[PDB]
Point group: D2
Chain length 230, copies 4
């Protein structure tokens, strides 16, 4: 009858989040701020080769760089893919990554500390139909992280990736899809978890990897896909 009516994990870290208005940008910016980060949100698509170095320059001190990069994944049949689709996908998802890392690494190497987290795709880990261009781009991200993480670990710098799929992302899982019983049957068959990973669950895992507790993780890819890929 009484029952009717009756965080600082990232405190003081300056965290830059790229394409902060799309893919996992909104969830990361919201949850990182709840956990005490100073969030630097940038909304630019990074097709412009000059823009990453300007965004990093202008942000000043960066403790954590979150490389959140995306365009809507092409559905093109693998035998029909053209140079325009390949360049649009790699220009947006792949080419900006080293540009962001080479801009931010000097300050992290100077202070022997810093983190870079890539918000990547489990499409790079497990093959699926009609996603060949996006999968290839996403594989370039994961292999870059595995190599850079081994390389920068001795400098006190942690470079890791999430490899996500079946996250509650409105770009791919709009409410009318989620409400469809054929969708729910497919999801339960394909995803052991039996539901989408929440935006909050994804960002809280990201927040753990951006925390002092995760200093032991270097060059590691973490699948987040409800068991679709582990």
């Amino acid at each position: 009858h009484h029952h009717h009516h009756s965080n600082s994990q990232l405190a003081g870290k300056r965290i830059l989040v790229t394409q902060a208005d799309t893919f996992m940008g909104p969830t990361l910016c919201e949850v990182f701020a709840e956990m005490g980060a100073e969030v630097i949100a940038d909304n630019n698509l990074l097709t412009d080769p000059a823009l990453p170095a300007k965004i990093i320059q202008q942000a000043g001190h960066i403790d954590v760089l979150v490389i959140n990069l995306a365009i809507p994944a092409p559905f093109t049949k693998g035998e029909l893919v053209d140079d325009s689709e390949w360049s649009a996908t790699f220009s947006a998802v792949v080419d900006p990554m080293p540009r962001l890392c080479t801009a931010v690494l000097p300050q992290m190497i100077e202070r022997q500390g810093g983190k870079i987290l890539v918000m990547g795709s489990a499409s790079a880990l497990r093959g699926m139909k009609r996603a060949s261009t996006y999968s290839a781009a996403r594989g370039a991200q994961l292999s870059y992280v595995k190599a850079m993480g081994v390389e920068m670990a001795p400098q006190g710098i942690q470079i890791n990736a999430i490899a996500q799929n079946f996250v509650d992302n409105p770009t791919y899982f709009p409410e009318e899809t989620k409400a469809n019983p054929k969708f729910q049957e497919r999801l339960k068959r394909d995803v052991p978890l039996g539901r989408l990973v929440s935006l909050r669950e994804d960002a809280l895992f990201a927040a753990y990897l951006c925390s002092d507790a995760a200093d032991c993780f270097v060059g590691q890819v973490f699948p987040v896909s409800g068991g679709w890929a582990v």
Copy 2:
């Protein structure tokens, strides 16, 4: 009067609240391998820790330990004996039986004992404290590696099976964690060990007990309900 105060006075540990508040967590072999650190870190995050110190070679014992605990939110399957260093061509039944009896056979007894209450309420977690020796081959570890592989494969199968019942079954696969049993002070004080460690382990240092336990604490939290049937290597990049 203790010597750690000369240089380690006034230092706040890595990751220093209520992440496991109101969770009853049973830790097996709580006095060995990762047990002590897990019990300390879980209590620090607000868990009610049920610490069992028994070696579980007795087939009857797992069911009795689960039975006496009543409600268990999280079962942490921490099973270990000193890893045999035996050359592969010299392994015998006594070594194989000793290792599997301690590390492998208790695992399903514990899970079959605790799963009924978890199935009935559609909630619960089982975390296996496993070994990256099961992921990546090393010399003179064949028996221990095989036993640790049984754990990880059990987890991947059971986690898929129990996910639809609202239960998360996962594993850590650790190596190069600072367990003084395997990395004694006399080893750490040897420059060739430090030089070899930086060669073989991308992190360039041992993973701290605390770092490993903080990751286990995350996996035991509500935030980690999205993880089912997943193995998480914790080895400073030695295995990823």
Copy 3:
């Protein structure tokens, strides 16, 4: 019914449970490629039996550890000690007994191969296969460790991790011919068909060949893309 090729030339290959799982096809294909095949038919629950079999066979160039019982499909929460013990006794415990019996001659010669016929159930989780998967995982982790350990002695220890192989035990003709099974298979297995017994055995034969001396402590999924 109702009432009733020199790829392996000059190699002695012992195949365990030669009448069972991949045994028959391995024996056929290895013989086709010039191997002298030692076909042993014993279930190896008896601890003394692997040393006897290896002793009696004499010179072994390749040991193929083919171990199987019908996989339990017991719900994970209902598994008992009898199931666990029967599965590990058959599929796991014999493996080191066979390897410790055969390795001395291979170490002496600085040459030899051990190939485990394992399961992709150890790589990818599936429902209602907990005991069998755990046992198969012991096999694959044993191979990875032993392969690293014995490589410097000039010995190659590897595994196949199969699933969705055209084994009539698990995939009867009548099931294969069912259109609902054909739909599920095309959904779950990229290959869109079962791997033939011969395809599996031919890959086993490649791993047992001199060309495969570069492979040590490696697991090779053979499941038509279900696990890679």
Copy 4:
């Protein structure tokens, strides 16, 4: 023997990386080898090479430049562009050119000669690793997609093969190289060019029709 009897196999950059060994061994196994020696940075060139060949049973995508050794924090756009232009971009140009004839007859194979640097992190190889990762993830996706049309697309992911580009006699003779190699490579020696090529030949055979979208590490246990 005749493991590849009556197969037309097109090998790209047939003069570079694994090209020469693949051409020798495939012909040894009874293939009709179509050797093309071009660097494929020109976007127009893959379609022309496939068009001129007529029937292709197997396409071997052997793409390489010497791997940059640049420190990760010092990589610039020209290194990134040069590596992806040579190693990545030509890959789908080649596949989109050959796949129509394969889809039409419901048969054919595409094998990518890739790198285990995409699987396991190594220092001073960030650009090359990223490029090689694009190849392996392309293969996994394309292999699933094309398997139902009766086409097999797979990759080798190699390292520690006896390739004189990376392991010249001077390096191999250094006992400090021989010490490191035995530390880092379970096999305890380099994989031979012939071993690598015979494995590739197996994957181009009818017996390997069961393999779709699969990556095969070939690195003496360095990556498995």
